[PDB]
Amino acid sequence: SARDIHQLEARIDSLAARNSKLMETLKEARQQLLALREEVDRLGQPPSGYGVLLATHDDDTVDVFTSGRKMRLTCSPNIDAASLKKGQTVRLNEALTVVEAGTFEAVGEISTLREILADGHRALVVGHADEERVVWLADPLIAEDLPDGLPEALNDDTRPRKLRPGDSLLVDTKAGYAFERIPLVP
Amino acid sequence: SARDIHQLEARIDSLAARNSKLMETLKEARQQLLALREEVDRLGQPPSGYGVLLATHDDDTVDVFTSGRKMRLTCSPNIDAASLKKGQTVRLNEALTVVEAGTFEAVGEISTLREILADGHRALVVGHADEERVVWLADPLIAEDLPDGLPEALNDDTRPRKLRPGDSLLVDTKAGYAFERIPLVP
Amino acid sequence: SARDIHQLEARIDSLAARNSKLMETLKEARQQLLALREEVDRLGQPPSGYGVLLATHDDDTVDVFTSGRKMRLTCSPNIDAASLKKGQTVRLNEALTVVEAGTFEAVGEISTLREILADGHRALVVGHADEERVVWLADPLIAEDLPDGLPEALNDDTRPRKLRPGDSLLVDTKAGYAFERIPLVP
Amino acid sequence: SARDIHQLEARIDSLAARNSKLMETLKEARQQLLALREEVDRLGQPPSGYGVLLATHDDDTVDVFTSGRKMRLTCSPNIDAASLKKGQTVRLNEALTVVEAGTFEAVGEISTLREILADGHRALVVGHADEERVVWLADPLIAEDLPDGLPEALNDDTRPRKLRPGDSLLVDTKAGYAFERIPLVP
Amino acid sequence: SARDIHQLEARIDSLAARNSKLMETLKEARQQLLALREEVDRLGQPPSGYGVLLATHDDDTVDVFTSGRKMRLTCSPNIDAASLKKGQTVRLNEALTVVEAGTFEAVGEISTLREILADGHRALVVGHADEERVVWLADPLIAEDLPDGLPEALNDDTRPRKLRPGDSLLVDTKAGYAFERIPLVP
Amino acid sequence: SARDIHQLEARIDSLAARNSKLMETLKEARQQLLALREEVDRLGQPPSGYGVLLATHDDDTVDVFTSGRKMRLTCSPNIDAASLKKGQTVRLNEALTVVEAGTFEAVGEISTLREILADGHRALVVGHADEERVVWLADPLIAEDLPDGLPEALNDDTRPRKLRPGDSLLVDTKAGYAFERIPLVP
């Protein structure tokens, strides 16, 4: 027979055609993604401002505290929402839209703390003119595996301990955070 | 005339399984380009303001306290018309229109409580250097079912009670509320 | 005669015509007013800000004090400019245009008062760090039929009196107002 | 043929007095729709700013002090180019252009007067905690015809005088003026 | 010959033409300048703001300090850059662009000064609550021909001297300037 | 026929030297209209912001401190990549993009130095009333080649040294740095 031959020579074209047009739509999608993901680094571009991170949400939002208010902010793709730590300094572009995580604020108000609260997250800190406030503790100061502390009879060690009613802390009253311990010798 | 039909059946059987390896990788391209495009499509929609709740109105409206000032603004169809409590933190969108309820601002100044006021609603508190301001109390400080306390002849106070003058309670002098009590120890 | 009949049948049409077109222009004016006055309630719509009222004018203006300056502000139709009392919290829409009157600011700075002034409107109040300032008194504290006083030998009454050099007042140093008396037990 | 003419004379006499009841109610519609439309047409024109007057210039210009800062701006044709006195309240329109004179800011800080100054224009006053600032005086404190005083050997001072050091006078340290004297009593 | 005559009658036109068109281009330039220089007085027009002059550059720019930041600002033609004195109140139009020079600030914070620095330009002033700060000195207080000082035994002269560890100064802590001496008598 | 040729040679010789007096004054018009137009063309280009330098990044970026806040922004491909020192006063254009090094903010608060810190980068200084803050030090306070000092048994300290606790050093607590040291004398 001579109809089968013409029936195949027709399927081969009906398949070469679907192969030309598919190979192209991929290039179109792989060009498209390299553009969208080039866009996401355009988001992390300077000039950018800095807020403290108050708390994490489930739906990829953050309570950040920036420019003096509590804001609830959408963050970038590029940023890993699990590994965001309470009270860490984040970065943010024009329209606020988070784009990095960062150290902890390292400079500022010192105040001595008077006790840790039932919560286990908040301190009674006492600032400078016998002023008392209640801050959140930056995850790093209640942190899981922090050494007992040991006594105070092999003198000044200052290496990282769990928190004592005595220590001096670096805080941001404006925000609501503790941040780090400090050696004082009074 | 029979090799002709192998050739064909062999170009075919070869394309249709290149056609199906592409089918499958183009699927897994669209599925990454569409999950990314929604994340980015979310970053477009503006962020959220937060503010303290100052009083319900027999209107639809509320007196909140947002980016510094005392404003009166409407609620969205979807939140509990009047069953949010005086002085809780709420969320607010771009055009300023409440949309959630929340916790209780839980960090801030500590004052002592000079005496609850005339009408059982305001307190007169003394701040950090003696200066006396008069604050609204927020519901869970005067809710209906709070134990009279007993006098103090067994020790421990950590558990909910009616406000006795003397108590150190926490307060946001720029907004006007007190928000929770503090387990004092000397 | 047959000219009079045609002369009336012509006046009746010349009057039926003026009656069709008048009945319509009214509907046009009564629709127009229901739109203008619907607009005036669109003005009192949320989101809205709140200022203190300094003093009233003849030509429907107010000296209000909102967001930190003195402003001379036009108010809404809906508003009864003679029932406005010096130092009364008003409300204001987007472009500042008053739209309600209201209670009295109820929370804030307590200070004690050292004397009323020859004016009979202004006080020497003495705040917290032996700081002295001079506020306007909210009409309610010099009000006409304020019961005299009587001594203090049937003890604590705290029901409304005329104002003593003793009492503690709720003020807004920012604005310049007193607002209410307070029972301090001392 | 005579009933015909009653009928007519009776349709007429009936319309022309429906025509005149409408005439009159449409009048009283236009008279409410036009009195309202002017009130609303007024709410369009922007509100007014206020500021203190810092010094006449032999130009047309004044150095006033408005939304917090110290600006120099023109006067409107219609106010008396030179006859307004150093440090009185003035009104200002949207494009900042003075338009009125006013009273004297009548409420604020109270300082004592340490000694009038070198040139007879500035005072050195001590504020509420001991800081000493140096303020301009406003005309009615150094105007030309003020009683030399008398020593004090009969009591009551409430009447206009030349400033004796000691006198507590009232002042607006962020703007720089003093504004009026105060009856002391011990 | 008759070709020379036609050769001159042609140069005279070729020169009358260059004379018509030149006389016009001048009017065009002299009209243009009277417009540009009319523009430069339109720049010094009210409403205008007031900054302190920090330091002068060579390239017609200034470090002024206005509205709380340090700014490097271009000034107008009309203004003589080498007659600008460190710490002199300047004026500035809408877009900041200097347009006058001025007196010195005249009112403000008094503090006594503990010493002049090795620099010879900066003082250790000491403000009110035993607060120490370090200001630039307005040229006028280290000025070249400042008479000596002399002892203090022909009593209070107050007439202009060179600066002592004793005197009280008028300063702007916000800017960083001293400005003038003051005769206190304690 | 010969007067004809004087006439001509005399109109010519007269125009061509009016033509050359204009030539020359039009030159001196263009030369003033173009030197002015460039001065004015400069006043168009926006002014400059300044801010403190908070830390180099192994990116291309810096953490500066500008119009009050703490931002991270890029450098102009012409300033020294990372050989600018921590906490020096840089300048910034309109779109906020650094463009220069500068001196050292030389005026401000004076504090005493309690003890240099753990990692030799932050100090803990006490301020003016007793509050203690923790500040970044700016290169020249801890650069490499600074004399150990010697003890105090001959006098005069004015010359560069390593920071001994006690020293009064200047500092800008809102930004975070200290900046230079002060020759103390009791």
Please give the CATH number for the structural domain made up of D1-43: 1.20.5.170
Q: E11 to chain F nearest CA, in Å?
A: 8
Give the DSSP letter string of E96-151: S-EEEE-----SEEEEEEEEE-TTSSEEEEE-SSS-EEEEEPPGGGT-TT------
The pair of structure tokens assigned to D87 is: 């440090």
Q: Assess contact for E148 and E173: CB atoms under 8 A.
A: no
Q: F143 to chain A nearest CA, in Å?
A: 20
User: A touches which chains (3+ CB pairs under 8 A)?
Assistant: B, F
Instruction: Kindly report whether the peptide bond that precedes residue D165 is cis, defined as omega within 30 degrees of 0.
Output: no
Rounded CA gap, C153 and B116, in Å? Answer: 24
**Which stretches of chain B are assigned E, i.e. beta strand?**
49-56, 62-65, 70-73, 89-92, 108-116, 122-126, 132-137, 168-171, 177-182
Cβ-count burial D50-71 (b if 16+ within 10 Å, e if not): bbbbbeeeeeebbbbbbeebbb
The rounded Cα D152 to chain-centroid distance in angstroms is 36
Whole-angstrom CA distances from D17 to C4, C5, C182 are: 21, 21, 67
Q: What is the dihedral of CA A31, A37, A40, A44, to 10 degrees?
A: -110
Rounded CA gap, C118 and D157, in Å? Answer: 12
Rounded CA gap, C32 and A56, in Å? Answer: 53
Q: A141 to chain B nearest CA, in Å?
A: 17
Which phi and psi angles does D55 have, rounded to 5°?
180, 135
Q: What is the radius of gyration, based on Cα positions, of chain B? A: 31
Q: What is the helix (H) or strand (E) element at residue E36, kind and residue range?
A: helix E3-43
Rounded CA gap, F132 and A128, in Å? Answer: 7
Whose CA is closest to F92, among F108, F113, F72? Answer: F72
Neighbours of C140 (CB within 10 A): 17
- Cβ contacts of A156 within 8 Å, gap of 6 or more: A183, A185
Whose CA is closest to E87, among E114, E57, E51? Answer: E51
Residues of D in contact with C70 (CB under 8 A): 49-50, 89
Half-sphere exposure of B79 (CA within 13 A, CB side): 19
Which phi and psi angles does B147 have, rounded to 5°?
-50, 135
Rounded CA gap, C180 and C142, in Å? Answer: 10
Residue A99 sits at the vertex; the CA angle it makes with A97 and A100, to the nearest 5 degrees, is 145
- Cβ contacts of C25 within 8 Å, gap of 6 or more: D26
Q: Would the CB atoms of F16 and E19 count as touching at under 8 Å?
A: no
Rounded CA gap, E36 and F81, in Å? Answer: 42
Whose CA is closest to F120, among F169, F149, F162? Answer: F162
Q: Report the DSSP pairing between strands F178-182 and A122-126.
A: unpaired
**Nominal resolution in Å?**
3.9
Q: E65 to chain D nearest CA, in Å?
A: 13
The pair of structure tokens assigned to E68 is: 């709380």
Residues of B in contact with A71 (CB under 8 A): 47-50
Rounded CA gap, F7 and F28, in Å? Answer: 32
Q: Would the CB atoms of E47 and D72 count as touching at under 8 Å?
A: yes
Whose CA is closest to D168, among D155, D153, D178, D156? Answer: D178
The pair of structure tokens assigned to B175 is: 């907004």
Q: What is the helix (H) or strand (E) element at residue D12, kind and residue range?
A: helix D3-15
Burial class (CB in 10 A: 0-12, 13-18, 19+), B55: middle
Rounded CA gap, D102 and D117, in Å? Answer: 27
Whose CA is closest to A111, among A184, A20, A26? Answer: A184
Which of C47, C170, C183 lies nearest to residue B71, judging by beta carbons? Answer: C47
The pair of structure tokens assigned to B115 is: 């005496």
Rounded CA gap, D86 and D89, in Å? Answer: 9
The one-letter amino acid code at E25 reads: T
Which of E50, E127, E184 lies nearest to residue D72, judging by beta carbons? Answer: E50
Whose CA is closest to B138, among B74, B51, B53? Answer: B53
Choose from C20, C74, C137 for mutation: most chain D CBs within 10 A. C74
Half-sphere exposure of A143 (CA within 13 A, CB side): 17
The rounded Cα C36 to chain-centroid distance in angstroms is 22
Whose CA is closest to F53, among F81, F80, F83, F84? Answer: F84
Query: Any idea what DSSP says for residue B49?
Result: E
Q: Would the CB atoms of C106 and B73 count as touching at under 8 Å?
A: no
If you measure CA to CA, which chain C residue comes closest to D130? Answer: C131
Q: Assess contact for F22 and F53: CB atoms under 8 A.
A: no
Alpha helices in chain C (DSSP H): 3-43
Please give the CATH number for the structural domain made up of E108-186: 2.40.50.140
Which of B69, B95, B122 lies nearest to residue C49, judging by beta carbons? Answer: B69
Using DSSP's 3-state secondary structure scheme, residue B4 falls into helix
Q: What is the dihedral of CA C61, C64, C67, C71, to 10 degrees?
A: 50
Experimental method: X-ray
If you measure CA to CA, which chain A residue comes closest to B3? Answer: A5
Neighbours of D124 (CB within 10 A): 22
Q: C171 forms bridges with which residues in the sheet?
A: C109
Neighbours of D133 (CB within 10 A): 21
If you measure CA to CA, which chain B residue comes closest to A68? Answer: B67
The one-letter amino acid code at E99 reads: V
The pair of structure tokens assigned to D100 is: 């009125």
Residues of E in contact with F89 (CB under 8 A): 70
Choose from A105, A110, A179 for mutation: most chain F CBs within 10 A. A110
User: E touches which chains (3+ CB pairs under 8 A)?
Assistant: D, F
Rounded CA gap, E66 and E70, in Å? Answer: 7
Q: Would the CB atoms of F33 and E37 count as touching at under 8 Å?
A: no
So where are chain E's domains?
1-48, 49-107, 108-186
Please say whether the dihedral angle defined by the alpha carbons of residues C172, C178, C184 and C186, taken in this order, is positive or negative: positive
Q: Assess contact for C103 and C145: CB atoms under 8 A.
A: no
Q: Assess contact for F105 and F145: CB atoms under 8 A.
A: no
Q: C51 to chain B nearest CA, in Å?
A: 9
Cβ-count burial C3-30 (b if 16+ within 10 Å, e if not): eeeeebeeeeeebeeeeeebeeeeeebe
Which contacts (CB < 8 Å, 24+ apart) does range C77-81 have? Answer: C77/C37, C77/C40, C77/D36, C77/D39, C77/D40, C78/C40, C78/C41, C78/C43, C78/C44, C81/C56
Neighbours of C160 (CB within 10 A): 12
Q: E161 to chain D nearest CA, in Å?
A: 15
- Cβ contacts of F93 within 8 Å, gap of 6 or more: F46, F48, F49, F99
Residues of B in contact with C47 (CB under 8 A): 71-74, 95-97
Rounded CA gap, F127 and E132, in Å? Answer: 9
Which of A45, A109, A184 lies nearest to residue F133, judging by beta carbons? Answer: A109
Please give the CATH number for the structural domain made up of A49-107: 2.40.50.140
Rounded CA gap, B176 and A77, in Å? Answer: 39
The pair of structure tokens assigned to A154 is: 């092999």
- The CATH T-level fold of domain B105-186 is OB fold (Dihydrolipoamide Acetyltransferase, E2P) (2.40.50)
Using DSSP's 3-state secondary structure scheme, residue C125 falls into strand
Whole-angstrom CA distances from C175 to B5, C118, C121, C178, D106 are: 98, 21, 15, 9, 12
- The CATH T-level fold of domain B44-104 is OB fold (Dihydrolipoamide Acetyltransferase, E2P) (2.40.50)
The pair of structure tokens assigned to F186 is: 């009791």
Which contacts (CB < 8 Å, 24+ apart) does range C113-122 have? Answer: C113/C163, C113/C165, C113/C166, C113/C167, C113/C168, C113/C169, C113/C178, C114/C165, C115/C165, C115/D185, C116/C142, C116/C163, C116/C165, C117/D183, C118/D158, C118/D183, C122/D106, C122/D107
Rounded CA gap, B100 and B79, in Å? Answer: 7
Q: Assess contact for A117 and A174: CB atoms under 8 A.
A: no
First-residue to last-residue Cα distance in chain F: 106
The rounded Cα C69 to chain-centroid distance in angstroms is 18
Tell me which residue has tokens 């003849």.
C58
Burial class (CB in 10 A: 0-12, 13-18, 19+), B145: exposed
- Cβ contacts of D79 within 8 Å, gap of 6 or more: D98, D99, D100, D101
Rounded CA gap, A116 and A142, in Å? Answer: 10
Q: Would the CB atoms of B43 and A18 count as touching at under 8 Å?
A: no
User: B touches which chains (3+ CB pairs under 8 A)?
Assistant: A, C
Cβ-count burial C61-75 (b if 16+ within 10 Å, e if not): bbbbbbeeebbbbbb
Q: Assess contact for B110 and C175: CB atoms under 8 A.
A: no
Using DSSP's 3-state secondary structure scheme, residue E168 falls into strand
The one-letter amino acid code at C149 reads: G
Which of E77, E131, E136 lies nearest to residue F39, judging by beta carbons? Answer: E77
Neighbours of A168 (CB within 10 A): 19
The rounded Cα B53 to chain-centroid distance in angstroms is 12
Cβ contacts below 8 Å, chain B against chain C, sum to 62
Residues of D in contact with C118 (CB under 8 A): 158, 183
Question: Do chain C and chain B touch with ≥3 beta carbon pairs under 8 Å?
Answer: yes
Cβ contacts below 8 Å, chain A against chain F, sum to 63
- Cβ contacts of E75 within 8 Å, gap of 6 or more: E60, E61, E62, E81, E97, E98, E99
Q: What is the dihedral of CA C55, C61, C65, C71, to 10 degrees?
A: -120
Whose CA is closest to B89, among B73, B108, B110, B106? Answer: B106
Whose CA is closest to E46, among D102, D101, D95? Answer: D95
Q: A153 to chain B nearest CA, in Å?
A: 27
Cβ-count burial A46-69 (b if 16+ within 10 Å, e if not): bbbbbbbbbebeeebbbbbbbeee
Which phi and psi angles does A180 have, rounded to 5°?
-165, 165
Q: Assess contact for B24 and B61: CB atoms under 8 A.
A: no
Choose from A5, A6, A15, A67 for mutation: most chain B CBs within 10 A. A15
Q: What is the helix (H) or strand (E) element at residue A134, kind and residue range?
A: strand A132-136
First-residue to last-residue Cα distance in chain D: 106
Q: Would the CB atoms of C48 and B73 count as touching at under 8 Å?
A: yes
If you measure CA to CA, which chain D residue comes closest to C20? Answer: D19
Using DSSP's 3-state secondary structure scheme, residue D79 falls into coil
Residues of A in contact with B8 (CB under 8 A): 5, 8-9, 12
Which phi and psi angles does F99 have, rounded to 5°?
-155, 30
Residues of E in contact with F26 (CB under 8 A): 22, 25-26, 29
Which of F97, F131, F134 lies nearest to residue A107, judging by beta carbons? Answer: F134
Q: What is the helix (H) or strand (E) element at residue D50, kind and residue range?
A: strand D48-56
Q: Assess contact for A172 and A109: CB atoms under 8 A.
A: yes
Residues of B in contact with A95 (CB under 8 A): 43, 46-47
Question: Do chain F and chain C touch with ≥3 beta carbon pairs under 8 Å?
Answer: no
Q: C158 to chain B nearest CA, in Å?
A: 9
Q: C56 to chain B nearest CA, in Å?
A: 22
Which phi and psi angles does B92 have, rounded to 5°?
-150, 140
Residues of A in contact with F137 (CB under 8 A): none
Which of E18, E29, E69 lies nearest to residue F19, judging by beta carbons? Answer: E18
Rounded CA gap, D161 and D148, in Å? Answer: 6
Rounded CA gap, D172 and D160, in Å? Answer: 21
Q: Would the CB atoms of B128 and A124 count as touching at under 8 Å?
A: no
Q: D22 to chain E nearest CA, in Å?
A: 55
Q: What is the helix (H) or strand (E) element at residue D181, kind and residue range?
A: strand D178-181
Rounded CA gap, E178 and D94, in Å? Answer: 35
Rounded CA gap, C151 and B179, in Å? Answer: 38
Q: Report the DSSP pairing between strands E122-126 and F90-92.
A: unpaired
Q: What is the helix (H) or strand (E) element at residue E19, kind and residue range?
A: helix E3-43
Residues of D in contact with C22 (CB under 8 A): 19, 22-23, 26
Tell me which residue has tokens 């800080």.
D109
Cβ-count burial C89-102 (b if 16+ within 10 Å, e if not): bbbbbeebbbbbbe
Burial class (CB in 10 A: 0-12, 13-18, 19+), E117: middle
Query: Any idea what DSSP says for residue B98?
Result: B
Fold match flag (C1-48 vs C49-107): no
Tell me which residue has tokens 């006080």.
C123
Neighbours of D22 (CB within 10 A): 17
Rounded CA gap, A154 and A149, in Å? Answer: 12
Which of D71, D114, D176 lies nearest to residue E47, judging by beta carbons? Answer: D71
What CATH class is the domain C1-48? Answer: mainly alpha
Residues from D contacting E (CB-CB < 8 Å) are 61, 63, 69-74, 95-97, 114-115, 117-118, 122, 124, 129-136, 176
| Per-residue three-class SS string for F102-167 | CCCCCCEEEEEEEEECCCCCEEEEECCCCCEEEEECCHHHHCCCCCCCCCCCCCCCCCCCCCCCCC
Q: Assess contact for D126 and D132: CB atoms under 8 A.
A: yes
